[PDB]
Design a protein around this ligand. Structure first.
Ligand code: MG
Ligand code: MG
Ligand code: MG
Ligand code: MG
Ligand code: MG
Ligand code: MG
Ligand code: MG
Ligand code: MG
Ligand code: MG
Ligand code: MG
Length: 51
RNA sequence: GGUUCUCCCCGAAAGCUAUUUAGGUAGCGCCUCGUGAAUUCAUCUCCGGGGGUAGAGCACUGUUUCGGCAAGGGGGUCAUC
């Protein structure tokens, strides 16, 4: 139970750190986001087919 | 901007790389928890290594002063077939 006082050890920030995307309500990047670069599953080429 | 009860144990970072990136983020570095593993790791002594820094030096690359020797160059006087 985060954000329930100093003694709990998870108060006033809820374990989210300080003013990042993870600290915003509904914040955070999608799966595979690499900071702006095209992710590895897009740097690498497709191969093969499904039989 | 704010995030509400208590105690105990451990305990950071403000670095690297990349980004329409530079008050964001991802991986790594650093933290915690769990599970494994070796006289694994750290320190010292001794031994075996590659350095080319500090310093020094002026053979080399350059730079710099004085003296000696001295072509050569410039100026003047004659001659300038
Ligand atoms: Mg805490
Ligand atoms: Mg944060
Ligand atoms: Mg805040
Ligand atoms: Mg402590
Ligand atoms: Mg780009
Ligand atoms: Mg930044
Ligand atoms: Mg900040
Ligand atoms: Mg920003
Ligand atoms: Mg040197
Ligand atoms: Mg030196």
């Amino acid at each position: 139970r985060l954000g329930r006082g100093i003694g709990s050890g998870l108060g006033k920030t809820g374990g989210r750190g300080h003013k990042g995307q993870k600290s915003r309500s509904g914040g955070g990047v999608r799966r595979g986001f690499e900071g702006g670069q095209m992710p590895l599953y897009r740097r690498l080429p497709k191969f093969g087919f499904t039989s």
